[PDB]
Symmetry: C4
Subunit: 107 residues, 4 copies
C-alpha cells in the first residue's frame, strides 16, 4: 500500500530562459543537488505570476548558473522573470515513518 | 498489479485565507486527523464555486482553527468563502481487502 | 520498472445527471463489466466539450444506466454529454501484458 | 520510496489525423524505438497550442508515421501540430538510473 507525499520543493525559482523548439525544465545542477532532485525526475511546476500548473521532467543546467528554463511546450506557460515553485513527490508505505521534505528557498 | 483508490475525503471545507507569496493547502490539524491525512501528503483539491481542480500538498494549520488556506500559486485558483473538497488516494493491490475511505463532512 | 497501463475503458457513457452540491456515479452493472470498483480513481474525458478530469467512482443503481458527475465535476459537463471513463493500473512492463476490459455503451 | 522518472520521449511527432468519435495512435515502429508498449499511459504535449494531456497508446501501422489523436483528445490538436510524447516509470532511486529512450522525429 502506498501514498504520495512531498519529497522536495524549490521555492522562488526565477525563470531565466524559455525555448519552445528544444533539441521540460532546465535547473542549475547545484540547485537540483540541494533539492535532492535528479536528472529526468518528474516534477510539478507551479507559477506565481500566472497560476499555471504543469508536470514535466528535469534537465541539468550548468552548476551555479542559476538557470531555470522552461523548454518545449512548457515555454508557452511562462515568461522570463516569472517565479516558480518546483515540487517532487514520492510514493511511500504509510506504515513507515514520515518523509521529511528537502526544502530549498531561493528568495 | 496496483490501482489508485480513495483513502480520505474532506467535504465542504470553506476557504478562510489565501496568501500568494507564501514562505500549497493549510488545513486545521484536527480536521486532518479526522481524515487520516498527514502533513506533506499529496491531495487533490476541487472547488465547488469555480470548478478548479488541482493537486498540491498539505501543511498543518492550528488545531481547531478551522483554517483552510490556499497558499502559493494555488491562491490564484480560489477566493475566500469558496467551498472545497479535499481528496487523497492510495495505491493498493486490489486482490487485498478494500480500503474503506475516511469521510469528513464539514457542512 | 513500474509503469501505468490501461486496465478498463467505458466508451460512450451518456451523462444522465449532475449534482453540484453532493465524483462520478456509474450504474453498478457497468462498473462490474469494466472491472472498476467503488472508490477507484478514474480519468473522465468528455467528447462534447473536451474536458479531462480525474475523480473517484460511486455506485449507481444496477441497470439504471446512471452516469452522473457530482460535486465540482458537475461544472465540467452537461446532461447528454458522451464520456469515456478510463482506469489505469501500475505493473511490471516485462511481466505478462494486461488485456484491458473494454465496455462500449454506444 | 518510489519516484517517477522519464523512461521514453518521442520528439517532433507531427499529427497526421484526428478522430473524435473513435487517446493516441502511434506507428508501431516508432513505439518500438521509444520502448513504448500498446496501452501504455503517456503524456502528450503540443508545441503549437501548448495543450498538455494524459492518454494511452494505440498501435498504428508499421512505418506509416501515423500520429493520431482519437476521442476527446481530438479537440486538443489539429493536423500538422508537433507533439512530444512522454512516458514515465516509478523506480526506487537507490537502484541504477533509468537511461531514457529518446526518439527525435524532426
Ligand atoms: Cl513540455
Ligand atoms: Cl501551489
Ligand atoms: Cl469532483
Ligand atoms: Cl481522449
Amino acid at each position: 500500500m502506498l501514498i504520495s507525499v512531498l519529497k522536495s520543493k524549490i521555492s522562488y525559482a526565477t525563470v531565466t530562459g524559455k525555448d519552445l523548439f528544444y533539441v521540460s525544465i532546465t535547473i542549475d545542477s547545484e540547485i537540483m543537488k540541494q533539492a535532492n532532485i535528479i536528472e529526468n525526475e518528474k516534477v510539478q511546476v507551479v507559477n506565481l505570476n500566472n497560476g499555471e500548473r504543469l508536470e514535466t521532467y528535469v534537465i541539468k543546467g550548468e552548476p551555479n548558473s542559476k538557470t531555470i528554463a522552461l523548454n518545449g511546450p512548457a515555454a508557452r506557460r511562462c515568461e522570463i522573470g516569472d517565479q516558480l515553485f518546483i515540487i517532487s513527490y514520492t510514493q511511500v508505505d504509510p506504515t513507515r515513518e514520515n518523509i521529511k521534505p528537502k526544502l530549498v528557498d531561493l528568495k
